[model samples]
Target: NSNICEVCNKWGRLFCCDTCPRSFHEHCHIPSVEANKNPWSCIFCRIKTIQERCPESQSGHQESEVLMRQMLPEEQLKCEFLLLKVYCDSKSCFFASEPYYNREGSQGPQKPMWLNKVKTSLNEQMYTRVEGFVQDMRLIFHNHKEFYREDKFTRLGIQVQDIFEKNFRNIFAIQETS
Candidate 1:
């Protein structure tokens, strides 16, 4: 008799659980069990066993964590802009907004041409000021190694960089007047 696999809901070579009514296909369960291990329990049963063995804390005891303080609006913007510069350096590009076509044909994925145009239209004076701000941030990261450790700096740098890139023109508009 062909039995349906519980995981996929398809008819296949299903392995019945030794401890429960559950059954699963060999590929369905992660770290597929060896055929030699005849009697096996599914992941659900295993988790149930673990929960029974070690009950969770009933008291409202939460883990204390050292969350990084939030940055001010202007400071946050500067950090984001500096992160883009860092990415640009790694990618060997003049700017993070530089456009490029994917490996596919002309119909490939590419940065919208309109975006480049918008970037070009930005005021030269404002752009220069923002650029200078980013430079100052880079200097701080380099000179004050103790406060901004390499790993922490890089992690936050990349995160803020992504946020800036995602909201490029909008972020620029806010920072331009300030």
Candidate 2:
């Protein structure tokens, strides 16, 4: 019912992180409790010291793919570790019982390692689906190559028909009169 933390659902406040803009509550945040007296820094702002690449520090620096990739690992790890820490602390016993980051100083999941595996799996599935369609097109092209060369317009019609039939079972049979 409440417009709570977008990630973890802590109640009462909604603050979007300055860097990522993903929302979280001050209480739900790691190192716990935020000060109403002082302006709060989001996880991104807080990590500037460790990351050594603050937005302010790079005022004149140009954005590059290489620099971004280099910076990404540390920033991602900091965010993920902070989140996993908070979630592990806040979750009810049922959810918390599952294997997770140890709260009492044991090492948590490495963010880069976790993300690498996730990205790889997702990319693999995406490519697999794409390659499947390409395979289908290859079959169609091979069969229709000579036909296409002889009569381009008729081959285009056949290609259109193939697509329609493959996708929708060719429900229409146009009836003509003399």
Candidate 3:
């Protein structure tokens, strides 16, 4: 349940979409979120359900989309698309890297983290603002590099972060180096 309607950007008697932390007013979501027996999935997460079924390849579709209009013109909605891409992209952070990023650091430090938690934080709507989204990403990588080694697991985070920062800058039209 969002503090505001994720669709129309207003507060109302809202319905929570179990699919993602998005909530909607009675008739604002794609189909009023159906207003059914409770526990609903939003249209955005439903798009992902099919994508998850695919082993890969829909990746190109998002790429095409991003360049077409830019994330700035329509931020929050498009922002969800980008995070959905990040979810797929961060599979490198979790899959085959370990059974999970669930444990406390191996021995040296003790900053416990579940990269999965950060992952689900997206679905949980842990941040309604894009700035918080950017910070959580930085926080995850920051802890990983600080608390752990520069090995392959952490390396992939740094690696994919290249994509994150680059896409992030482009999405926000950042030009600080000037």
Pairs that collide, model 1: none
Give the alpha carbon lDDT tens digit for every residue of 1-178 in model 1: 2276654467777878888886667754432445776667655565456446555412222111101213433324333342433333342122224344333223322223222232232312233334443333333323323323443544544554454444443323232222
Instruction: Please give the CA lDDT of all the candidate structures.
Output: 0.40, 0.38, 0.53
lDDT for model 2, please.
0.38
**Candidate 2 has which clashing residue pairs, if any?**
none
**Tens digits of per-residue lDDT for model 2, 1-178:** 2356754656566766545545677545543435563555555455555536544433332223212332243434343343333243332211222223433433443321222232233334432332232333333334333333455533543554354233221111122223
Candidate 1 accuracy as TM-score: 0.32
Query: What are the per-residue Cα lDDT tens digits for candidate 3 across 97-126?
Result: 223244565543234344344445544656
Evaluated at residue 6, the lDDT of candidate 3 is: 65
- Using all chains and alpha carbons, the TM-scores for the candidates as numbered come to 0.32, 0.28, 0.43
- By the lDDT metric, which is better: model 1 or model 2? 1
Give the higher-TM-score candidate: 1 or 3.
3
* Model 3 poorest ten-residue lDDT run: 92-101
Name the weakest run of 10 consecutive residues (lDDT summed) in model 1: 58-67
Off by over 4 Å in 2: 1-4, 9-11, 15-20, 54-178
